[PDB]
């Protein structure tokens, strides 16, 4: 009997976060968010470990980071790891209106989403828990990279600094999981989500995995069995550094290739349905308590 999740509640979740502000690192929203959210997954019967680092972004900017650990079964060598960013971007660079190039974005979509599903999996795991110790993992610092009007260099390890972090340095020692899955803009509508390059080349069977779950459970017209893009996201660190299979379920527009809310003041709840949620987050579900 793998649990229902809860799209009304995983919803809640997003909102409580986006009404917060922005969640730029080095604010005081920023601050509170993260407070909330170690509360959150405290109050669902984690084990709470946080890692406070000093990352340089890519202009020498200090960001104090926090990433956020909830760990259940911690004892468990058998594990399975779940990830999401779970701060903003301070510039929306890709809004169509140049004026609000530097403005913070609200990240409902891009941050809130898959923080929210994945406090809504961590509220049942507790509930019920599976076979596997499980891992909630929420990174810091991933979307402070090189801003697209920026002339210079725009290296890639300037996106991602707390999963380069979190990879580096485990919040435990000899930590390891069967394999991981992110979830990066979980939440908008209409989205469909196909098969990421790098998880491809990492992490085909979990892919493979989580594709057929998704079929299973109904969700067969929202996970499309097809390819999308590469994309440089957390799963590419936590691949390369930490060596953990892990994959990125990541909407693909056929227009716009993200979301088109993506790094756009429009970035807020207007565009956020519970169903895109639902659809993620039972697919995860299936997946982590089938594991055995
Ligand atoms: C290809 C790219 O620029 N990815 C940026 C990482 C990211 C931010 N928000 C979502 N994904
Ligand atoms: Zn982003």
Known sequence: NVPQFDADSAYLYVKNQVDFGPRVPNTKE????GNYLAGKLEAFGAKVTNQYADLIAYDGTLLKARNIIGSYKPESKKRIALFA???????????????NHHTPILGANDGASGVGALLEIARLVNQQQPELGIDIIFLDAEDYGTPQFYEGKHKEEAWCLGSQYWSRNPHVQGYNARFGILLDMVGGENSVFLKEGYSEEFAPDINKKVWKAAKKAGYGKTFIDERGDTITDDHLFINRLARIKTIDIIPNDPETGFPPTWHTIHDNMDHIDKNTLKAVGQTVLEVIYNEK
Request: glycine residues 0%; proline residues 5%.
């Open 85 to 99: 960013h779970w701060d903003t971007r301070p510039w929306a660079d890709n809004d169509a209106d140049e004026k």
């Open 30 to 33: 920023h601050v509170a968010c």
